[PDB]
Amino acid sequence: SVFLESDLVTVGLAVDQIVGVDQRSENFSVVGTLKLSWHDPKLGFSPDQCGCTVKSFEDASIRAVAGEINLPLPSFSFYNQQGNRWSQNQVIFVTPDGRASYFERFTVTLQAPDFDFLAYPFDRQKFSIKVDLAVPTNMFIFNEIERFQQVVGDQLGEEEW
């Protein structure tokens, strides 16, 4: 194939809690984990030049890493967050074969226009967490969803939702 096909980035998302729901402002604050994984041969390197096998960029967004090293990366966004999300343990590490992966435990306040509390308290709501890619379908596309962790976490207690 000589079409310069779009790179295949697998994505996995897990929800640990829904920490808050501001229903007058119609937003919900959710904590979870996100894991992107894509193969970029141009990102490969010789393991001996730096000693360590895996080259890791800590606590810096994918866009910031793409700024650091002038290479294309699948920068993403939540498309609805208000304010800045709290990114924890986020690290993007690359394997010499070229298979890079990004991990981030986020605490993000998504906006939920789809909330309709006209039937409160008998209402069913949709918490839609939408991870968009900041690059077009020509460059990267979410190929396969990854069930690395339980999609919704089970935690001790009845919980509100």
5 is in an annotated binding site: no
115 is in an annotated binding site: yes
Interacting partner of 68 out of other proteins, a second copy, Ca ion, none (Cβ under 5 to 8 A depending on kind)? none
Query: Is residue 19 a contact partner of residue 30, using CB atoms and an 8 Å limit?
Result: yes
Which positions lie near Ca ion, rule CB under 5 A? Answer: 113, 155, 157
Task: Select from other proteins, a second copy, Ca ion, none the partner in contact with residue 128, using the beta carbon and a kind-dependent cut-off of 5 to 8 Å.
Answer: none
Binding site for other proteins (CB under 8 A): 41-42, 44-49, 53, 95-98
Q: Is the dihedral of CA 135, 139, 143, 145 positive or negative?
A: negative
- Under DSSP, the state recorded for 96 is T
Six token digits for residue 17 = 């809690």
How many C-beta atoms lie closer than 10 Å to residue 30's C-beta?
22
Site track for a second copy across 64-93, x = CB under 8 A: -----------x-x-x-xxxx-x-xx-x--
User: What is the C-alpha to C-alpha distance for residues 51 and 56, in angstroms, rounded to an integer?
Assistant: 12
C-alpha–C-alpha distance, residues 138 and 7, integer Å = 8
Task: Single out the segment in contact with a second copy by CB under 8 A; choices: 2-10, 35-43, 106-114, 142-150.
Answer: 106-114
Torsion of CA 52, 57, 62, 66, to 10 degrees: -80
The annotated binding site is made up of: 26, 113, 115, 156, 158-159
Residues that bind a second copy (CB under 8 A): 16-17, 19-20, 24-27, 31, 46-48, 51, 53, 58-59, 63, 75, 77, 79, 81-84, 86, 88-89, 91, 96, 107, 111, 113-118, 132, 134, 153, 155-158, 160
